[PDB]
Design a binder for this molecule. Structure first.
Ligand SMILES: Nc1ncnc2c1ncn2C1O[C@H](COP(=O)(O)OP(=O)(O)OP(=O)(O)O)[C@@H](O)[C@H]1O
Ligand SMILES: Nc1ncnc2c1ncn2[C@@H]1O[C@H](COP(=O)(O)OP(=O)(O)OP(=O)(O)O)[C@@H](O)[C@H]1O
Ligand SMILES: Nc1ncnc2c1ncn2[C@@H]1O[C@H](COP(=O)(O)OP(=O)(O)OP(=O)(O)O)[C@@H](O)[C@H]1O
Ligand SMILES: Nc1ncnc2c1ncn2[C@@H]1O[C@H](COP(=O)(O)OP(=O)(O)OP(=O)(O)O)[C@@H](O)[C@H]1O
Ligand SMILES: Nc1ncnc2c1ncn2[C@@H]1O[C@H](COP(=O)(O)OP(=O)(O)OP(=O)(O)O)[C@@H](O)[C@H]1O
Ligand SMILES: Nc1ncnc2c1ncn2[C@@H]1O[C@H](COP(=O)(O)OP(=O)(O)OP(=O)(O)O)[C@@H](O)[C@H]1O
Ligand SMILES: [Mg+2]
Ligand SMILES: [Mg+2]
Ligand SMILES: [Mg+2]
Ligand SMILES: [Mg+2]
Ligand SMILES: [Mg+2]
Ligand SMILES: [Mg+2]
Lengths: 164, 164, 164, 164, 164, 164
C-alpha cells in the first residue's frame, strides 16, 4: 500500500512532517514528489531539487518510515502528467491532495484521492516561512532542526535576501 | 564526505551492493545517480526510473547507510551535465566511476574521481542477469532478495520476454 | 487552393462552423490548426488535442468539405513558428486570421492573410461557452450536436466544474 | 469501436491501404498515427508529417470510413508514450501492431493488441518504394494514385535523389 | 581579462553603448550575452536574436573593442544556467550586472560581479524606447545610428505596432 | 551581400581558413554557423561551442573579414532548421556547402547554394586532425597557430586521449 503526496517543499516544514506522519498511519510507504524540481533561486522557489531532497531525507531518516523523495519537473502537459509521475515513482495506490488539478488528473486515471489534514496553517506554510526569512522574523521553530541545519549549510536565507 | 556513483541498475545486483558497501567505508553518505532515467521498456534498459528507485531503496533500507537514489535523465549536452547532476543531488566530494566520459567531465570540474573495485563481474552484471531472465536460467541468487520481490511485483521478467 | 485557420477550439462551436463554411467558398480545402495542443485540463483549455480533433471531425464529416484537423503545440519560438506549422500541414495558400501575431508571422513569410467574418460573437465564443458551462446556463444550442455528444462522452462539463 | 495503427508511411502504400480496409471490417473508425513526425529529408524518412497527412487523407477521402491521421513525434520516453498517444487521439479500443515494443506498452496499459495481416510485402514496402524512386525503377503501381499525385506536387522523388 | 554582460537588447540603445565603453576601460574583451534569444515578435521582445546580433555588431564595429555577441536562450533552470553560459562563451573573469538573480547565480559559482553605471536611464531604456515607437513619440536619438539603420531594414517599428 | 557556411569546426583547421578567405572574395560578410553547438567531450566533437568560438575568432581577428561566429544547436527537425538558422543570424544571401542535406534544405527555401573549394583535403580535415591527436602524430602545422594556442590552454589533446 503506497501513498503519494506532492509539494514544492521550499522549504519542507513542520506541517509537512505532520501530514506525512498522519499519512504513514494509512499506508505502508510514502512517495514524496518534489514538484517544480527545476525551479530554484526565486522568491517562491529558493532551493534546488537536490537541496530539497537533502532537507527531506535529513528530516525523515530517523523515523520508522519507508519514503521516496523524488524530484518531479514542471512539464507543460497535464494530459501526460500522471504517466510522467508514474514513470519516476514506485507503483502507488492513494494520492493525498487538496489541489483541484492534481485531483482531476489522478481521478480520471482511476486513482483514489484524499484530502490531507492541514496543521497550523497560519505558521506552517512555505510562503509564511520565506516571508519571515526575508523580514528578520524568527522562523526556525517552524521547520525540523534538520532543515535549519541544511538552510545554514547552503546559506539559503542569505540567498533569498539577495534575490529580493 | 559524500560519495557519488551512477549506473543504470537494470537491475540493481549483488555487485552494486558490494561496491556501495565498500564505498561506504570511505564516506559518510552515498548518492546513487540512476542514469538513463527516461529509458525503459528495452532489452538493455527494461525498468523505469521509479522501478529502479524501488529496487535500490528496498535493497538498502536495511543498512545503517545514508543514501540518496536520484533519477538522472540522459540530457544531450556533456558540457553542462555535471551542473545538472549537481542541481539534482546533495553536494558531494568523491566520484566513483571507471567510465571515461563521466571521469573526464567531473575531473575537468575539479572533482576527485576513483575507480571502484569490480566484484565477480562474470555473474554480477545487468547484461548477464537480463540474458538469464530471457532464457529461463536462475538469476535470483545474483541480486538482493528485495530486488527479486520487486521484479515479481512489476512482472519484470515477463516484460523482458515479451520485448524479445 | 488550400486555406489555413488556427484556434484552440475549446470547444469547437457554431461560429467556427459558419466561418469554415464561409472559407470553403473561397478555397478548395481547409487545414484546421488545433493550437495549444498540449494544453488541457485548465479553465481556458479544458479539452485535450485528441478530444478537440474528435469534436471537429464529428462536426464536419457529413459536409463534403476536404479538411485536415491537425494538432499544433505551443512552442516558445515565434521566429520558427511558421516553419513549424508548415512541417505539420499540407501546403497552403491563404491564412484566415484576425490575430495580430499569427497575422504578422505569416505576412513576414510572404503569405496572404485575410480576416474571417465573425458570426454572432456575443454567443459564439469558447469563453462565453465555458462561462455558461461553469455558471449553469444553457450552451448546447451554441455548438454542433456532435460537439454536445463528445462533451457528454468525456464528461467535459463535470471536468471543467471540478477544475474551478 | 475505434482501431489504432502506427507507422512512418514514407510513403503510404497499397499494403497500408489493404491493412486499413481489413481493420475497417472490425472497428467503426481508425486512428492512423503518423510515427516519426518530426523526421523528414532523410533517405529513410524523406517526407514531412504534413506531406504524409496529405497523402493519407487524399488516399482515404475516397472510402466510406472515418479516419484520423494524427502526427506523433518520436519522444524519447517509452514509459509515457501511450499517454502521449492518448493525449493526441480520440479514445480507441484495439491496437493493430506486430511491433514488440508497441505491443508491450499498450498491453501494460490494458489494451488489446492484434497483428495485422501483411499484403504483398516484397513489393508493398516503404523501403522497397524508396529504393525504386532513387534508382529510376517503376514505383507508381505500388501506392494509391492519390499518393503519386502528392509525390509529384512536392517533388518528392527529386528530393530523395538529391539527398542521396 | 574578459567581462560578461547580459541583456535582452530590444533594442540596443545609447545606455548600452556607454555601459560597454565603461566596461571596456576595465577589461580587454567583452562577451555580450544576448538573452531571451528565442523570444521575438512580442511587445516586450520585438526582435530576433539574429536581428539583435546585427544591431549590436553594427554599433560596435568601428569602436576599438574585442567583443563576442552570443545568443543565449531562456532555459528554465537557474541552477545550471551559469554552466550553460560557460558552454557557449569564451572564459570570462568579471560579470557586470545589477540584476540580483544573475548576480546570485554567478557569485555562488565564485565569480566577481560588479554593478555597471546607469546612464540617462529615463530615456535610455528598452521599455521606454518601445513605448515611444508605439506611441509615435520620437526615438532615433536614443540608440546608435546603426540601430536605426537596422530597425529600418527589418521594419521593426511597423512590426511592433501591428503586434499592438 | 552576406554568405553563410556551417560546420562543426572540431577543430577549425587551415582548410577552413582558406575556404573562408575564398568566400570573402565573393561576399561582404560571412556568417560562420558552428553546428552541433551542444555536442562536446566526444571523439567526433571534443570541443564546446564557446571553445570553438574562441578558436575561430582568434584565427580570423587579424585578417580583413566581417564575420559572425554563431552557435547552432543540433535540433532534430530538418523541416524547420533553415528558419531556426535564420532566427539566429544576420540575413544572408548565399550558402556555401557541398552537404546534400544542407543544400536541399536551403534550395527548398529559395536560397542560392554553392560548393566551396576543397583545399588539401587529405590533411585538412577534422577527422584526420583528431586521429593524429589520438594516436600521436604531428597536427600543429595543419591548423592556424591561434588554434594550437587555444588547444593548449584548454588541454584539448589530453581530453581527447582521455575519452578514447
Ligand atoms: N464566432 C466566430 N465567427 C467566425 N470566426 C470565429 C468565430 N469565433 C471564433 N472564430 C475564430 O476562429 C479562430 C479562433 O478560434 P478559437 O477556438 O480559439 O475561438 P474563440 O471562440 O474565440 O475562443 P476563446 O474565447 O476560447 O478564446 C480564429 O480564426 C477566430 O477568427
Ligand atoms: N500545514 C500543512 N499541514 C498539512 N499539509 C500541508 C501543510 N502545508 C502544506 N501541506 C501539504 O504539502 C503539499 C504542498 O506542499 P507545498 O510546498 O505547496 O506547501 P506550502 O506550505 O503550501 O508552501 P507554499 O506556501 O510555498 O506554497 C500539499 O500536499 C499540502 O497538502
Ligand atoms: N560486479 C560489479 N562490481 C563492482 N561494481 C560494479 C559491478 N557491476 C557494475 N558495477 C559498477 O556500478 C556502476 C555500473 O552500473 P551499471 O548498472 O550501469 O553496470 P552493469 O551491471 O555493468 O550494467 P549493464 O550490464 O546493464 O551495463 C559503475 O560504478 C560500475 O563500477
Ligand atoms: N505490405 C504491408 N502489408 C500490410 N501492412 C503493412 C505492409 N507494410 C507495412 N505495413 C504496416 O504498416 C505499419 C508500418 O508502417 P511503415 O510506414 O513503417 O511501413 P513499411 O512499409 O514497413 O516502411 P519502411 O520500409 O520504410 O520501414 C505496421 O502496422 C505494418 O504492419
Ligand atoms: N539606461 C541604462 N544605463 C545603463 N545600463 C543600462 C541601462 N539600461 C540597461 N542597462 C544594462 O544593460 C543590461 C540590461 O539590458 P536589457 O535589454 O535587459 O535592458 P533595459 O534597457 O532595461 O530593457 P527593458 O526595459 O526592455 O527590460 C544590464 O547589464 C543593465 O545593467
Ligand atoms: N580541407 C578543406 N578544404 C575546404 N573546405 C573544407 C575543408 N575541410 C572542411 N571544409 C568545409 O568546412 C565545412 C565543414 O566543416 P566541418 O568542421 O564539418 O569539416 P571537416 O573538416 O570535414 O570536419 P569533420 O571531419 O570533423 O567532419 C564545409 O562548408 C566544408 O566545405
Ligand atoms: Mg502551496
Ligand atoms: Mg554497466
Ligand atoms: Mg482566441
Ligand atoms: Mg517499416
Ligand atoms: Mg531590462
Ligand atoms: Mg565530412
Amino acid at each position: 500500500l503506497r501513498g503519494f503526496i506532492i509539494g514544492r517543499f521550499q522549504p519542507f516544514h513542520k506541517g509537512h512532517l505532520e501530514v506525512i506522519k498522519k499519512i504513514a498511519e494509512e499506508v505502508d510507504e510514502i512517495i514524496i514528489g518534489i514538484g517544480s524540481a527545476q525551479k530554484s533561486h526565486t522568491l517562491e522557489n529558493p532551493f534546488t531539487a537536490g537541496e530539497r531532497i537533502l532537507m527531506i531525507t535529513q528530516s525523515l531518516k530517523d523515523y520508522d518510515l519507508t519514503y521516496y523523495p523524488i524530484p518531479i519537473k514542471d512539464i507543460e502537459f497535464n494530459s501526460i502528467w500522471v504517466s510522467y509521475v508514474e514513470s519516476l515513482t514506485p507503483p502507488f495506490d492513494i494520492v493525498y491532495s487538496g489541489n483541484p488539478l492534481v485531483r482531476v488528473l489522478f481521478e480520471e486515471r482511476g486513482y483514489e484521492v484524499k484530502r490531507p489534514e492541514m496543521f497550523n496553517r497560519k505558521e506552517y506554510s512555505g510562503t509564511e516561512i520565506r516571508r519571515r526569512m526575508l523580514n528578520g522574523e524568527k522562523w526556525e521553530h517552524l521547520v525540523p532542526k534538520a532543515v535549519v541545519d541544511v538552510i545554514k549549510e547552503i546559506k539559503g536565507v542569505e540567498r533569498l535576501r539577495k534575490l529580493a
